Design a protein around this ligand. Structure first.
Ligand SMILES: Nc1ncnc2c1ncn2[C@@H]1O[C@H](COP(=O)(O)OP(=O)(O)NP(=O)(O)O)[C@@H](O)[C@H]1O
Ligand SMILES: [Zn+2]
Length: 682
RNA sequence: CAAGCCGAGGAGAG
RNA sequence: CUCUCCUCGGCUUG
């Protein structure tokens, strides 16, 4: 391993105690300086006949294996014992034991917290911090309100104050936080920015920050920025299509007699639709809820029209209504006035909308703008042409990847592309899998795919190859994502683009984040130069406040919903105001999943085979006689006992009918019994 | 590989 | 404070 000049000075105080933060720019060899500090710490503790164990904490899964392979092991294999843990191994099981070996640990975080609370909650073996001598951390800036990793530090600080009260002593470990930039936490003033920085430092018990200042030219030579750049467009033609939908929506409303006091093709209208649907369901009146459920889809279509072709929205709707018709046919294998009206309204115009949509006279501006942007680069760079795109949603990524596959020009210049999204199981999309992710990464590094379409998945963690033409298509989250994307584009003649519309404040937000970036550095300078006694005073104050801010939160959130009422309810279908179950019939398996195993509920529903699995069905999706999907099948002990949700059902209390929607099971107070085969058997 | 439970953070709009 | 979008982590059934 090698020791750079400017990494030296930033590392220097850490080498003799002095828990600190380190914020350097991106790509400056953050991991490597980490590694060096490790080796020093361990060699030191050996030379003093003192036990030395380091643990690394990360926030994602992949970074653990990542760093295990590339940085720590290749250099420290010979002197020491290393290991890499995560939720994707089998070494989680005896975590207290691996500590008894493996002086170097890498780990996903919540592993640790789980073990601590097992030591402090059950009679399990567990572990305490005393068994360490260092904690190295990545991505400092997640240390905020009740994240994971702040439990850890709140406990560290609790024990530190125990030590301090003792002094007026357990040897606490050293801490070393590493980041790119800690970031201003939503503050409108330089002073509150400062306050936030100090809040971080108190949550890390730091002594400084140690930005690089002295050996700065070596950085500028070795490391450089891209060039910021904007591209803007405007649209007032909306020629055939938009109005063609607004007509429909207006017709539905004037069938429903509901006044939005709002506009078509925005987000407040959506919120209204939601609460209206919820109200209609808590009351039970159809004709309003179901129309709302459709209007939401129409609004979504319009929103994506603002960014994406008409064809994609038409397809979105086609999928929706095709599904609904298939549902009604599987059930009927009756036709209420509502659904009949809605379908008759839609399908008559289906062919029209298909014609209107395919119309290259007025496709979209931003797509053309990025056409120009992209072609410029891939003509300039010629086979060293790595690319990245960022957007907001998943569907957008699929659409763009599809298009770039379709249009010939992109394929002509060698614009090989692939999409990328996150693995969360929610949000009406089939997510990806970690394997797919890693493979795409390796293809990019290989060069199979020249450019990637991504959500916010890329602006952290996983290690993409350096790039040229990072852009930004309808997304401005905050300064952190801004800088982290800004730190990708090496390979000179790099850029950082933003593509937006005119009448949607985004460039606004871009500038705000730019100012925030310029602000935080000022604050850093304010604090680095702060006097040590004053600094100490303030961090002590903040640590106290943080710990007291814990206790209170503890005193008001013990249970907050504890009234266990077994069968005091009735679950109805939310589309059709129809009984489905009572609370007694339901049971739980593994104290997590809810399920019912009475033949009454058995006969009520229908199974529609899966589309996720065709991409032999195993987990069937349940539907009603109305058509409302309810749940999913399940295989427990071979019993195909069908699970369900509480997002599609409505509750009715027996007393006075405040019917409520809950969106998940933990929110409600009442408890359900565990499953046992004594019922239905013996 | 599919299904689901819980928790956390960020952003928008209200 | 609520809704939506986005990401992440831990954990179970198969
Ligand atoms: N001290 C060093 N000496 C030699 N090469 C280094 C050093 N630090 C980093 N590198 C090289 O830089 C690459 C890895 O470092 P880097 O690009 O900073 O990844 P990183 O630690 O993830 N930076 P970041 O993305 O900001 O977290 C490899 O090509 C290394 O060879
Ligand atoms: Zn129904």
């Amino acid at each position: 391993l090698q020791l750079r000049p400017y990494q030296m000075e930033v590392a220097q105080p850490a080498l003799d105690g002095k828990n600190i933060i380190i914020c350097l720019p991106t790509g400056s060899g953050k991991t490597r300086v980490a590694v060096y500090i490790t080796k020093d710490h361990l060699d030191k503790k050996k030379q003093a006949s003192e036990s030395g164990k380091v643990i690394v904490l990360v926030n994602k899964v992949m970074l653990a294996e990542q760093l295990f392979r590339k940085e720590f092991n290749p250099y420290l294999k010979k002197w020491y014992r290393i290991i890499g843990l995560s939720g994707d191994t089998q070494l989680k099981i005896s975590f207290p034991e691996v500590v008894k070996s493996y002086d170097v640990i890498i780990s996903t975080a919540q592993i640790l917290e789980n073990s601590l609370l097992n030591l402090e909650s059950g009679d399990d073996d567990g572990v305490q911090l005393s068994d360490f001598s260092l904690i190295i951390i990545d991505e400092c800036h997640h240390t905020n309100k009740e994240a994971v990793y702040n439990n850890i530090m709140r406990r560290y600080l609790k024990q530190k104050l125990r030590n301090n009260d003792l002094k007026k002593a357990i040897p606490l470990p050293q801490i070393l936080g590493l980041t790119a930039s800690p970031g201003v936490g939503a503050a409108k003033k330089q002073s509150e920015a400062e306050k936030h920085i100090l809040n971080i430092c108190a949550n890390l018990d730091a002594f400084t920050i140690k930005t690089v200042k002295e050996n700065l030219g070596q950085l500028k030579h070795q490391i450089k920025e891209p060039c910021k750049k904007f591209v803007i467009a405007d649209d007032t033609r909306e020629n055939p299509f938009k109005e063609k939908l607004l007509e429909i929506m207006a017709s539905i409303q004037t069938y429903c007699q509901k006044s939005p006091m709002s506009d078509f093709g925005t987000q407040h209208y959506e919120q209204w639709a939601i609460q209206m649907e919820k109200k209609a369901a808590k009351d039970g009146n159809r004709k309003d809820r179901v129309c709302a459920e459709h209007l939401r889809k129409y609004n979504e279509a319009l929103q994506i029209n603002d960014t994406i072709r008409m064809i994609d929205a038409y397809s979105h709707l086609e999928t929706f209504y095709t599904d609904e018709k298939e549902k009604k046919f599987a059930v009927l294998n009756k036709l209420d006035e509502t659904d009949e009206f809605l379908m008759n309204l839609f399908f008559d115009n289906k062919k029209m909308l298909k014609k209107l949509a395919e119309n290259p006279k007025y496709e979209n501006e931003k797509l053309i703008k990025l056409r120009n942007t992209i072609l410029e680069q891939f003509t300039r760079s010629e086979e060293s042409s790595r690319g990245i795109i960022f957007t907001k949603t998943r569907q957008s990524t699929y659409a763009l990847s599809q298009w770039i596959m379709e249009n010939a020009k992109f394929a002509e210049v060698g614009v090989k592309a692939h999409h990328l999204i996150g693995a969360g199981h929610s949000s009406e999309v089939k997510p990806m899998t970690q394997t797919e992710q890693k493979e795409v990464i390796s293809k990019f590094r290989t060069g199979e795919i020249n450019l990637l379409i991504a959500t916010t998945v890329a602006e952290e963690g996983l290690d993409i190859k350096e790039c040229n033409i990072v852009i930004r298509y309808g997304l401005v989250t905050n300064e952190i994502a801004m800088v982290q994307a800004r730190g990708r584009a090496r390979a000179d003649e790099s850029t950082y683009v933003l593509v937006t519309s005119s009448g949607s404040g985004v460039t606004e937000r871009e500038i705000v984040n730019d100012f925030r970036e310029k602000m935080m550095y000022k604050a850093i300078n304010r604090v680095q130069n702060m006097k040590p006694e004053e600094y100490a005073h303030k961090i002590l104050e903040l640590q106290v406040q943080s710990i007291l801010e814990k206790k209170m939160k503890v005193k008001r959130s013990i249970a907050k919903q504890y009234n266990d009422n077994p069968s005091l309810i009735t679950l109805l279908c939310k589309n059709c105001s129809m009984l489905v179950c009572s609370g007694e019939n339901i049971h739980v398996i593994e104290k997590m999943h809810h399920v019912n195993m009475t033949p009454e509920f058995k006969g009520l529903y229908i199974v529609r085979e899966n589309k996720a699995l065709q991409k032999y069905q195993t987990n069937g999706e349940i539907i009603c006689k109305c058509g409302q999907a309810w749940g999913t099948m399940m295989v427990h002990k071979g019993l195909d006992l069908p699970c369900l949700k509480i997002r599609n059902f409505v509750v009715n209390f027996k007393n006075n009918s405040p019917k409520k929607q809950y969106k998940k099971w933990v929110e409600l107070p009442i408890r359900f019994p565990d499953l046992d085969y004594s019922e239905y058997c013996l």
